[PDB]
Design a protein around this ligand. Structure first.
Ligand SMILES: CC(=O)N[C@@H]1[C@@H](O)[C@H](O)[C@@H](CO)O[C@@H]1O
Ligand SMILES: [Ca+2]
Ligand SMILES: [Ca+2]
Length: 122
């Protein structure tokens, strides 16, 4: 089961993984990491984060061009919900090229080595 908005379904099994491992899990399941493109999609992801009590990865990253967060298509964001002061590319100074979502629905850029809840979209 999962949470759905329109034709998109978000699912989790409560796995917690690094970004690269999370991406692999979703792809092997024939989906991709959660990619909220609207307020309504963001709220569905947020509900799951609240339930699981763990920040989740989103798909988007700025590994290609620093500060330009893109989907797995390489396209720029059509929606964002950054927490106040984010994205800051600064884990106590160190680069942050991946994105986590909080249980309040706001986003923070993080090191892609961080271990976070895996939510996939289908
Ligand atoms: C690894 C991690 O999640 N670090 C976060 C950083 O990303 C965020 O910008 C900062 C805000 O003050 O809090 C923590 O340092
Ligand atoms: Ca960055
Ligand atoms: Ca940050």
């Amino acid at each position: 089961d999962g949470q759905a908005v329109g034709e998109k379904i978000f699912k989790t099994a409560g796995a917690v993984k690094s970004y690269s491992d999370a991406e692999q899990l979703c792809r092997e399941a024939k989906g991709q990491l959660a990619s909220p493109r609207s307020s309504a999609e963001n709220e569905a992801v947020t509900q799951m984060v609240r339930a699981q009590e763990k920040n989740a990865y989103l798909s988007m990253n700025d590994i290609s061009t620093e500060g330009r967060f893109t989907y797995p298509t390489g396209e720029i964001l059509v929606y964002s919900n950054w927490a106040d002061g984010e994205p800051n590319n600064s884990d106590e100074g160190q680069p942050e090229n991946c994105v986590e979502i909080f249980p309040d629905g706001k986003w923070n850029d993080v090191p892609c080595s961080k271990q976070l809840l895996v939510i996939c979209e289908f």
